[PDB]
Amino acid sequence: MEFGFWSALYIFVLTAFLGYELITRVPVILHTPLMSGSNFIHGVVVVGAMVVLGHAETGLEKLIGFLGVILGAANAAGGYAVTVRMLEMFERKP
Amino acid sequence: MEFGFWSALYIFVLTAFLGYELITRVPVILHTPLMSGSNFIHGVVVVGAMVVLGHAETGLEKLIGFLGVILGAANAAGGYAVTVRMLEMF
Amino acid sequence: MDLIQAAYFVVAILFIVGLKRMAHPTTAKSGIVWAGWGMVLAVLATFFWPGMGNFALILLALLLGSVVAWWAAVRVAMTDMPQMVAIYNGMGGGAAATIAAVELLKGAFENTGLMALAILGGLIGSVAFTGSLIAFAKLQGIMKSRPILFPGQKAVNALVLALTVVIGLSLLWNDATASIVLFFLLALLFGVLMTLPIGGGDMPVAISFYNAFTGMAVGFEGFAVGNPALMVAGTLVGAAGTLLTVLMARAMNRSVWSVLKGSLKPIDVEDAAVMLAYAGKVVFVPGYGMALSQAQHKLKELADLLEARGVEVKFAIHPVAGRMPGHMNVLLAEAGVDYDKLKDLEEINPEFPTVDVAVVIGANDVVNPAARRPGSPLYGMPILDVDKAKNVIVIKRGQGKGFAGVENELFYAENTRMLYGDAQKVLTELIQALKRL
Amino acid sequence: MDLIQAAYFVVAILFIVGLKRMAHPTTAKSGIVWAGWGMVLAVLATFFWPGMGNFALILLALLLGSVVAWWAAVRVAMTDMPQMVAIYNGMGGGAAATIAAVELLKGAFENTGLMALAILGGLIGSVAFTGSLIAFAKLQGIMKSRPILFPGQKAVNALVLALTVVIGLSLLWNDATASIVLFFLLALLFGVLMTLPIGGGDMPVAISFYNAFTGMAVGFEGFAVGNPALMVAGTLVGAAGTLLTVLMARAMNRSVWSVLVGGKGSLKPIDVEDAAVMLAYAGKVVFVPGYGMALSQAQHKLKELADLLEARGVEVKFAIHPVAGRMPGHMNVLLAEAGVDYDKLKDLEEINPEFPTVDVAVVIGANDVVNPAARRPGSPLYGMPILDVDKAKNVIVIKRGQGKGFAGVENELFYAENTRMLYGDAQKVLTELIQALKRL
Amino acid sequence: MVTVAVPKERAPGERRVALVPEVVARLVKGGARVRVERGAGEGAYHPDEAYQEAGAEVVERGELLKGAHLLFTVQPPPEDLIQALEPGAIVVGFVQPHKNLELVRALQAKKATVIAMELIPRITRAQSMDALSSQATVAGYLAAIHAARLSPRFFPMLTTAAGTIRPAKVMVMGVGVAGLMAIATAKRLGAQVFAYDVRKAALEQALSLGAKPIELPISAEGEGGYARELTEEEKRIQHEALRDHVAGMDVLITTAQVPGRRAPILLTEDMVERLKPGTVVVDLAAESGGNCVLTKPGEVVEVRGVRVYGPLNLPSELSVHASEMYAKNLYNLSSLLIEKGAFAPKWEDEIVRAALLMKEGEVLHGPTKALL
Amino acid sequence: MVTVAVPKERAPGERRVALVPEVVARLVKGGARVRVERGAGEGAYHPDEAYQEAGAEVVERGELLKGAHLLFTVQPPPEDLIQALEPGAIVVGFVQPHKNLELVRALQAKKATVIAMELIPRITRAQSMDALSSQATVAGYLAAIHAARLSPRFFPMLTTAAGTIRPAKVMVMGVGVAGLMAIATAKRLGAQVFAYDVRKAALEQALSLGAKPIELPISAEGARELTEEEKRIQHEALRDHVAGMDVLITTAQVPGRRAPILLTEDMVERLKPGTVVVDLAAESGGNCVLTKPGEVVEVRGVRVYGPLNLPSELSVHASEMYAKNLYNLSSLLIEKGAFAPKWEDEIVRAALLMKEGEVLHGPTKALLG
Ligand SMILES: NC(=O)c1ccc[n+]([C@@H]2O[C@H](COP(=O)([O-])OP(=O)(O)OC[C@H]3O[C@@H](n4cnc5c(N)ncnc54)[C@H](OP(=O)(O)O)[C@@H]3O)[C@@H](O)[C@H]2O)c1
Ligand SMILES: NC(=O)c1ccc[n+]([C@@H]2O[C@H](COP(=O)([O-])OP(=O)(O)OC[C@H]3O[C@@H](n4cnc5c(N)ncnc54)[C@H](OP(=O)(O)O)[C@@H]3O)[C@@H](O)[C@H]2O)c1
Ligand SMILES: NC(=O)c1ccc[n+]([C@@H]2O[C@H](COP(=O)([O-])OP(=O)(O)OC[C@H]3O[C@@H](n4cnc5c(N)ncnc54)[C@H](O)[C@@H]3O)[C@@H](O)[C@H]2O)c1
Ligand SMILES: NC(=O)c1ccc[n+]([C@@H]2O[C@H](COP(=O)([O-])OP(=O)(O)OC[C@H]3O[C@@H](n4cnc5c(N)ncnc54)[C@H](O)[C@@H]3O)[C@@H](O)[C@H]2O)c1
Secondary structure, three states: OOOOHHHHHHHHHHHHHHHHHHHOOOOOOOOOHHHHHHHHHHHHHHHHHHHHHHOOOOOHHHHHHHHHHHHHHHHHHHHHHHHHHHHOOOOOOO | OOOOHHHHHHHHHHHHHHHHHHHOOOOHHHHHHHHHHHHHHHHHHHHHHHHHHOOOOOOOHHHHHHHHHHHHHHHHHHHHHHHHHHHHOO | OOOOHHHHHHHHHHHHHHHHHHHOOOOHHHHHHHHHHHHHHHHHHHHHOOOOOOHHHHHHHHHHHHHHHHHHHHOOOHHHOHHHHHHHHHHHHHHHHHHHHHHHHOOOOOOHHHHHHHHHHHHHHHHHHHHHHHHHHHHHOOOOOOOOOOOOHHHHHHHHHHHHHHHHHOOOOOOOHHHHHHHHHHHHHHHHHHOOOOOOOOOHHHHHHHHHHHHHHHHHHHHHHOOHHHHHHHHHHHHHHHHHHHHHHHOOOOOOOOOOOOOOOEOOHHHHHHHHHHOOEEEEEEOHHHHHHOOHHHHHHHHHHHHHHOOEEEEEEOOOOOOOOOHHHHHHHHOOOOOOOEEEHHHHHHHHHHOOEEEEEOOOHHHOHHHHOOOOOOOOOOOOOOOOOOOEEEEEOOOOOOOOOOOOOOOOOOOEEEEEOOHHHHHHHHHHHHOOO | OHHHHHHHHHHHHHHHHHHHHOOOOOOHHHHHHHHHHHHHHHHHHHOOOOOOOOHHHHHHHHHHHHHHHHHHHHOOOOOOHHHHHHHHHHHHHHHHHHHHHHHHHHOOOOOHHHHHHHHHHHHHHHHHHHHHHHHHHHHHOOOOOOOOOOOOOOOOHHHHHHHHHHHHHOOOOOOOOOOOHHHHHHHHHHHHHOOOOOOOOOHHHHHHHHHHHHHHHHHHHHHHOOOHHHHHHHHHHHHHHHHHHHHHHHHOOOOHHHHOOOOOOOOOEOOHHHHHHHHOOOOEEEEEEOHHHHHHOOHHHHHHHHHHHHHOOOEEEEEOOOOOOOOOOHHHHHHHHHOOOHHHEEOHHHOHHHHHHOOEEEEEOOOOOOOOOOOOOOOOOOOOOOOOOOOOOEEEEEOOOOOOOOOOOOOOOOOOOOEEEEOOOHHHHHHHHHHHHHOO | OOEEEEOEOOOOOOOOEOOOHHHHHHHHOOOOEEEEEOOOHHHHOOOHHHHHOOOOEEEOOOOOOOOOOEEEOOOOOOHHHHOOOOOOOEEEEOOOOOOOHHHHHHHHOOOOEEEEHHHOOOOOHHHOOOHHHHHHHHHHHHHHHHHHHHOOOOOOOEEOOOOEEOOOEEEEEOOOHHHHHHHHHHHHHOOEEEEEOOOOOHHHHHHOOOOEEOOOOOOOEOOOOOEOOOOOOOOOHHHHHHHHHHHOOOEEEEOOOOOOOOOOOOEOHHHHHOOOOOOEEEEHHHHOOOOEOOOOOOOOEEEOOEEEEOOOOOOOOOHHHHHHHHHHHHHOOHHHOEOOOOEOOOOOOOOOOOOEOEOOOOEOOHHHHHOO | OOEEEEOOOOOOOOOOOOOOHHHHHHHHOOOOEEEEEOOOOOOOOOOHHHHHOOOEEEEOOOHHHOOOOEEEOOOOOOHHHHOOOOOOOEEEOOOOHHHHHHHHHHHHHHOOEEEOOOOOOOOHHHOOOOHHHHOOHHHHHHHHHHHHHHOOOOOOOEEEOOEEEOOOEEEEEOOOHHHHHHHHHHHHHOOEEEEEOOOOHHHHHHHHHOOOOOOOOOOOOOOOOOOOOOOOOHHHHOOOOHHHOOEEEEOOOOOOOOOOOOEOOOOOOOOOOOOEEEEHHHHHOOOEOOOOOOOEEEEOOEEEEOOOOHHHHOHHHHHHHHHHHHHHHOOOOEOOOOEOOOOOOHHHHOOEEEEOOEEOOOHHHOOOO
């Protein structure tokens, strides 16, 4: 809803419906790994915390931003690993 | 009106992937009446022909805008009535 | 920070949700309920565009466009519907080329890329307008034609285009009034010259092609004028028309590029009615012949009489049966056949070896077994398996062919029999003979 | 920043693509790799975000953050996975809440909307943080799995939150650095409170609900600062997560509101699609036809489905019960009609020791013939030779409602842990079953 | 260690045998001695040496029943068998008291335990012993085979370059074990078939194969299980619409029977007269009466062109499979008399107590108590 | 204005009528007068009053041949109608001189034009006239029915409360028109069917209907490459195959020749008790050696039936087809309703047995000496 107001308000609703339709008509045996996949995708918080940490000023901003980068790095690196191991039960043992 | 380059290119891409996936699950029975609607929808081409006509000054600028609104409103009200009766056949 | 923008955002959602609800059959009915408000809402919102003049002239062109088309849409027969998409698809294309035209006479682009999006939209606008007027001319009949196919046309058509492009690119540094006209003329020239090697059949693959084009045109012009509704909806229409053209090109025996043994065994109307009454599973396979004669109303009357006796009746619908997209659909709609009797190929194909009688009416290529092999021309066809049925009845006047240009080997098989005569003159004779049994 | 936004645009697309491909049967595996390259580029592009400082601090929080997670996941067992998603989900809500507080302490914006989305994103983040760790603690056994109630908690949750909101809104006019962490701990507190009444079995749906909550938060937070990648991926996971929530509640034969509080076996309804799911991927399938198939005249939609399976290479066999139907050999004639080959038709004695290796068992309109009541002498079903359909690893039954067989007894096979139920008319369902299998 | 016998049947035209060498083979595998008469399976094309290989014993009649505990007969055993009976021996097999009234009263003077196979109850237990189902199956089959053999008409809808032949219209009047069997095979050949009955459950059993059920202006059944008792204003319209529907038929296969009475008439003189010539009347109910008025037992007749056939023993003509189906009926019923190859009868059983005709000169069956 | 006559067939055991009343009506509306003898269709269940409802004149046998131009017979006309004939008159119907030599010599001594119905071309142009086609299908359908009738075994597979019945394994030897409908009807019944023929083209037509073909390997077209090595390729291979059989339907025939011995003596000894052999080729010898003509015989345990005149049994439909065969053949002899034969059409030119008395067919003319 900014850069500029209306442009990203479109974006928001255009992403709200697109993500919706992408998840309509999904099978049942794949309910958890896609949830593990989405958990990883929203691990993007790093990029924004990297900036926030790269723009840390008051020292108290230096630690809580240091936390977020780890908190995000754990959501990402931990999201990928949980999604890969769920997909190997969908493969035959060679 | 103020619309940036990266904000617009996202929109562009977002509504692109949006429509794509709406249309993925269409029955064969719908193809023609479904075609009649998209034909109607892009009839919003009146709005632009109206905006530009309300901004004309010279003797040759005022004409093609008047041409664009007749085509546009004809694409508008024409697409609606062909699909209303096509969807009535249900 | 504005309230004219707020309309457009609600305007686009209604377009998208409408679209979404139009895509699927159960809710398609409430579909046009949603986009129609998005069109009623958008037109009203632009009256409040800061400092609008010529207010008497805009409203006139609005009523002149609206009432003329509203009338033409309701008072035209249901079978003549493919070109109505094309002509409105033309109107919009023209109206898109106009937005490019007026904002180039003023010299009103403080950016190089914006002109490049304004001119390119007009390129598409003029082409999609004029081509849909030639398509119009070839479906209607006042100067109908198949492909003209003149020698070395692919070299002179690709010449015109490249010359329009050079005239188009000449507007960047030289926005002369002279450089504006020729560009449009050449775009209106190419738009026509292009719809010359197009078959009076292949037009379905061309109208949506022009429909997606009109969408792209509207898309780019919206980006050029800073108009968010034409931005969103334009590309929301174009891309839909894009996939649409391909899905209705590959549903055809064709792709998106080719456009640009036995003996005949006759039968009597009384002998054919005997096959129908005792036949458990019957399938009607309609085509262009049902359309030319207007036999549709005499086909459902046979589908109901069989159903009143018990006969399990279904309608095999080849997406390409006719001279438009869903030609069978809207006629089997105008008569009043239930859509659940209407099955496309893929849901009814494995049902045929058990179909007691597969009655075929005015169809040839859609049910031609030549589409299977790489030797004959009909290859690439989603084939309709009528040959595996236990008994086949074909309705056609005499010794005529279809579109691709081949005789049918279904006619000669030991299981198929022919029924000679005018389409509805045959079916009425089928009903009244079945009524006598 | 043309190179970063163009990257964040390339990054934007890859996610949607990843999200799409991770939803489909065959592309499922490859979907995650598409999303894997996007993160590498995005983070590699924000290394070049203009005015980036504290680099030796950035590299280390990447080091000890990327391994602490990677370690925790590869070594643990295959059944402790529901909780592992929750905690990684938790930390992601914490990571968004951390971005929120920083620009709130700066006073970096005087914009009243951006602040409101920074704050509102920070609220839901801390809630999605501490909520997922309480959710994490319940499946592990460190905390009581069963719903934890205390007298009048519907007015404790709702007034802890009601303040968490009114205090969040106060940061607009008064962003004193003494009403911000109290807003943050109130959300870290409401995070704990609202994930206390959810049952240990009711926990998966809660994790998907917090997965949406983290996704939503990183959307609004991604909007609060000028960050396109966050804007794209945030609401893309958020909008996915809430749909993810309802469908996971739809499967558990419940609704989302029941799990948010909630303060020999049973029948199991399955949709026409999920049956085609188990059927597109099996290896040993056996159709068990009964009298229901006859009343529906289904035989032609059944054989059509069996051929669709033979093509996928799936081993299809037919088990005709001696008394299946109402007359002797009732099925044999109706299957000779459709055109079923006779080698695919085997009787009980040569097929019963073959059932423990049969994956899916599709019963169609049969009841008394498949009933495991026939083994016991106490039932009116004894004496009749029995079909060992319950030994099959999975079972799917077809019939309209509750209608019984001939003799007139209930079937305990329907209630089985390995048996699922499909409702509606026989050939009407097979048609829907064939339609869904070609779609995959 | 038990012994069980199986005889050569005496009734005129019977070509069956109670036990086949296969079922005999698995019973000596069960643990018993089998006594067989000289040439009993010869009607079902199982030679004398076919049983000896199984582990039985081939002897002459009279020497057969001395020592035995179980007798396995097709039709009720005659004089010389009834007298050869030992006490504590169980007589298993068809009796049909109404037709074999003599052979019945003969069994009382020697006080023998008889169980009639026609009185097997119709729950699930003894469906693997349900002989009523197995043998009426064989009959209904041949009922249709003969119908196409004798019909001057194509049963199939025959389409050729010569002309269109409509399929023969067949009506099954009485829809039971034989009826359904007849209905099925008629559609196998391509005939458009009709099915007459009164039970609304039987009319549902009919359409399951692909037949249009005959519902007259007066549906003779409704809610609970009870059929209608027509007065003087209704058994005529049942007859009239039943006379008009039958009139436009090429084959009428009739299977209506009752366990204690002579077959009730479905095809009357006047229904017969309104039949077109070339029509085929098939009558399986001839073994106890016959549904058609003009049916004479075991002979093929023609009058006004209409051909009427009445066969007593159909399982005899398809003797190979019929006997095979009959022997396992006894084998799954041997699960109620034989215990690990030892004589263990079960007087407590609900199939036995609900089928046992007598208990050593003691008629339990009330209806068999009724006819004497 | 033309006149068609229909005689009563008087050969030992026939009920086929030449014209059914339903066809005569197409001819009476097709311009012709039709004369029918008193009581002709009473074998095919067409009464006197049925014919007079169409537009025909019911007359005496002596009255039958007064002015009539065309004579439509089922079997070759007896000599009491050969003499009541008219000049230039042309007879239509089976003549078959191998059972009627002396009646054939009787038509040539009188000087009457005749057309034989076992001479119609076997190309797809003349399938709407083909009698033996419409009279080999009627037999083959019945070939399967009598097989099941006499069979003490079940044809279909059935899973009951009393075991698993296996389908009767049926072989249909020599698959022509009689062979094709002997398979399908056995298939209709649910029998596992097999089909043997010396020809590659009758192995593919058989596989088309559903049966698995027997294992080759000769040519013989079209007992020519069959007798190369002198039938030790025919007798060797399918001796082991017939060992699994429950049923054997044999239709194999050669035009004018003895029926090639397909089932010998050492082949019918490996046959199981209750096995059935139906032999349609009983009217000119026997495919099997044990076929007593017209009698239900039984040796060892294998029943042998040799059915003479099977279209006779299915009279109503065999006649219905045969009359249509004659009606569609009448389009070359009747122009609007006036006697107009075509001496120049290839169908009449390869079938005209005698014109004006002279026997035009090849060997036909041979033996009579
Ligand atoms: N619908 C589409 O999407 C589309 C678009 C473009 C091209 N095509 C092409 O068109 C073909 C479609 O085949 P189709 O079977 O639908 O139609 P078709 O092959 O064009 O068959 C038309 C037939 O209808 C018969 N007919 C016309 N008027 C009749 C009347 N009054 N009574 C009876 N019969 C009449 C004609 O036979 P007689 O003259 O013998 O009567 C003619 O052969 C395909 O090969 C496809 O490539 C289809
Ligand atoms: N075969 C014989 O010779 C013979 C002889 C004596 C007794 N029997 C009896 O026959 C019975 C056979 O048992 P069975 O398991 O095969 O059948 P069953 O136990 O009678 O079960 C039939 C089931 O099919 C379902 N059904 C009916 N129409 C349907 C439709 N259109 N779509 C979906 N489902 C439908 C019904 O449930 P809904 O109503 O809910 O759909 C019904 O519960 C035995 O119990 C035996 O006692 C047979
Ligand atoms: N499933 C069962 O419960 C059951 C019961 C009895 C017999 N059977 C079996 O069914 C087989 C065939 O018998 P079916 O049931 O087809 O015979 P069916 O159904 O034809 O019934 C006998 C006939 O008697 C007539 N009838 C009876 N009472 C009458 C009245 N009051 N007024 C006028 N008409 C009357 C009816 O018209 C009926 O057609 C037999 O082999 C038998 O073993 C089954
Ligand atoms: N449109 C068509 O396809 C069509 C239709 C009808 C007839 N026809 C032709 O008509 C012809 C006549 O057939 P018909 O019905 O009079 O034959 P038929 O009734 O006399 O039967 C004889 C069959 O046995 C086969 N045979 C011959 N010698 C044999 C041997 N030594 N061992 C085993 N089998 C042997 C032959 O191939 C023939 O098919 C056929 O050759 C056929 O090509 C074609």
